[PDB]
């Protein structure tokens, strides 16, 4: 970002010149200014809720009570699960 050596206002790029709108100053130096914003998609993928464990007993399963997709596989033979958000115990 550059400022006029005389008026003190900022200089904007016009063609090959940077011109001060208030005083008409010009220069041979061009500096490009951009504003870059980043968007994060860490948790925006499509969820598939099959009661399969990822690490330990942590499985992905939809809770009938609150609707969270975090569960703990309490018992494999009974397909018994427990919600990690509201402690609800259910079967899927």
């Amino acid at each position: 970002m550059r400022f006029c050596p005389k008026c003190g206002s900022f200089l904007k790029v016009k063609g090959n010149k940077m011109v001060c709108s208030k005083c008409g100053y010009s220069d041979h130096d061009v500096e490009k200014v951009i504003l870059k914003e980043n968007v994060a998609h860490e948790n925006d993928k499509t969820i598939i809720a099959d009661g399969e464990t990822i690490e330990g007993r942590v499985a992905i399963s939809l809770c009938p009570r609150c609707g969270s997709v975090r569960a703990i596989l309490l018992n494999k033979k009974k397909r018994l699960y427990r919600c990690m958000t509201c402690n609800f115990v259910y079967n899927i």
Binding site: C66, G67, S68, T85, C86
Partner: protein, 89 residues
């Protein structure tokens, strides 16, 4: 194991009460009596079972004049004070 004679007695004795109770209760009673195994069953047992079922149904009927709206409101609203908590509501 219920022989055909006792089964016929059961079917005959169950057809004279079809108008005395609801149809679903009659079906449930018929389905339950046919599953009795391991016990030597008797006609007097069938008579007692059917009479007790009819009497038990008759004893459970609501009484005219009941303020059922207030009772329903109190039965629905009272557990509302006992509730202690996508994240649906």
């Amino acid at each position: 194991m219920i022989d055909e004679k006792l089964k016929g007695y059961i079917d005959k004795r169950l057809n004279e009460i079809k108008d005395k109770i609801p149809d679903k209760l009659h079906e449930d009673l018929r389905a339950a009596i046919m599953d009795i195994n391991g016990v030597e069953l008797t006609e007097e047992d069938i008579d007692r079972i059917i009479d007790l079922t009819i009497r038990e149904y008759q004893q459970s009927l609501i009484e005219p004049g009941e303020a059922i709206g207030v009772v329903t409101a109190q039965s629905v609203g009272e557990p509302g004070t006992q509730m202690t908590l996508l994240n649906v509501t």
